[PDB]
Amino acid sequence: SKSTTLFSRHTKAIVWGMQTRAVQGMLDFDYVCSRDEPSVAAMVYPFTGDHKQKFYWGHKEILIPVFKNMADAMRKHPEVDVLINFASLRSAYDSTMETMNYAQIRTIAIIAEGIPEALTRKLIKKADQKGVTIIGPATVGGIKPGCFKIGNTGGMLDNILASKLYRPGSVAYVSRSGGMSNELNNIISRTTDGVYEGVAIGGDRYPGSTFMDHVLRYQDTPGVKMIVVLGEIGGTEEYKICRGIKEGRLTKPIVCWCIGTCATMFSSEVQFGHAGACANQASETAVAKNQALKEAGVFVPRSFDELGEIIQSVYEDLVANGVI
């Protein structure tokens, strides 16, 4: 694993792409989170010339610079340590590799779906060399209430407010699905004191960072008291949680459910929507992972339908013992 802490209420990011709606959405979040400053320092968009774009900080109109060249944005905004990459699948590899020539960048989000797995492996290799945390590809991103939200994650203000995403509770999560990450925002806000941090690792076969990369960050974060994982059929990554618990490395309660139990009932092989969501062996099915996690001490509900109930029971037990 790499850095325990990716974002804070001082995080400054560069957004690669002309994504004014996502940026303004980030600023709305920043505002109700009572951040001192917008989380977006600059955008990079090579299809336009240098310019400035109008956004709103509350009711006040502000200007955020847009740079044709990454080097100008980096040089002019040395406070930036996060880049969010909305480049199309065709150019996300090259713009991400280029980002990683800038030592100031410690975290990158890669949004695009459809990046070849062999290119992502090379991005992962370079990120691992440099200690850069990659979130994605093929992800909406993630959210750290009070601090920072990646792009479209969490949507508009009405949802930020309804799911209490403007201040951290005690529950951290990691999901393979972005849409379901926002459903977890909802479930957790209703059953606990709320999300402390959530990450959507994306649906590709080789995520830039895995379940266990973030689970470990959560184990090591004092403000986190329990951890929720939405796994999925395909690959073996969830077994690393079992191992982490067995080794005594993971000690906070973990609630996990793996989606894709239906595939055990189909007569033929089915590739689901996520590029990584296809079991190449019996161990990679959701049924197998769910059973293994349960046996290892993970709180596993009977099905998705009972996830909220087990989260709340674990949460209430932690309150009862003074942990929360």
Added chain:
Amino acid sequence: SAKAISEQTGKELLYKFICTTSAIQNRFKYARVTPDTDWARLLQDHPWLLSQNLVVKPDQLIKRRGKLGLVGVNLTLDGVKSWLKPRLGQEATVGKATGFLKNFLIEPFVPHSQAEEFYVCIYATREGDYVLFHHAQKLLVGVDEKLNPEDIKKHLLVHAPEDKKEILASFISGLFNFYEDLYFTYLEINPLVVTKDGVYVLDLAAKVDATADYICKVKWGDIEFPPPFGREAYPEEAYIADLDAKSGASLKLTLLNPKGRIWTMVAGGGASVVYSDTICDLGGVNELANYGEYSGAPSEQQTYDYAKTILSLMTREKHPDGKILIIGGSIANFTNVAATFKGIVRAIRDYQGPLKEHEVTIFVRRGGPNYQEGLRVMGEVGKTTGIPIHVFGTETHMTAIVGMALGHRPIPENLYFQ
């Protein structure tokens, strides 16, 4: 995602593009047989079919063909025709999948000893590509490493017959470079044969990373990705796949049972699977017609085009108990629910006739940007068409509508639109 290719596709690419000091024999000496084959015309194109005995086997993404008794070995042409008579067109169950044997490959028999047979496999992991050799040796080739003949001799060919090390190493080096250049993720040759006359590829299975089409289209040409054995390929699936190709947004459709009475049109790669899980937990696996999803803020026109495909497909033949459509999703991050539900609502309008003939009941649950207006137009399209539509929002648990639609729980009217 990674998609299997037929043995014939893999061999065509291998024979065209592999660079090796080795002399590969029987290049392009294969013939495809279907139930529509004109055997005289087949023989005109492939005179070598008479020149020596033959091997015949299906080429349909069936694995372990030898251990299934599905390989006819060392046959004359008359022997092959006789071998095909009870197989060509027959049902076959392999594992738990059932399909028709419809595509077969004929190739020359190569006489050889067991000690001239070798196993080679390359497969992708996170940490790089493992190369397997057996006469077992296995080597991880890291993401930035080359695989030279001397690396193969050193790490993999320890036990190989001394007089075959040079040609094996040359072949496997070229094979690995071909694996990388054409964006393979899995390539197995079982067996590779090396006799005094050179190298023979008797067998091949492979997957390529289909997302690399924009890099590889020149080499791949018009490459075919067949469905897995046990399913058919349908034109509606190809229509959606072509839409999916044209946009950042994700549009996916897989037909599981075209006669099934339970259809889904769910937003999100995650939620679609959860809805599908729930349907099967409640006993509906044999009536689930499809898996698919839309996600990533598709336009209203994209959703309409997706929806009209579904609605077309569920109004082909009637079902005694009517049909259900599950229009579900999470609370979306940024997909515009009003724009997308307006597209679905317009498809429903255009199909309201068929949808009433087939006794369709629609259940909706969705949150997200503008979801309140999306839920309203769904409610309005039901009232204006006669189609029963039950509409729920963020205050209903995501999957509760599955239990409702299959009769396991009552419909709570006190939750409509919230």
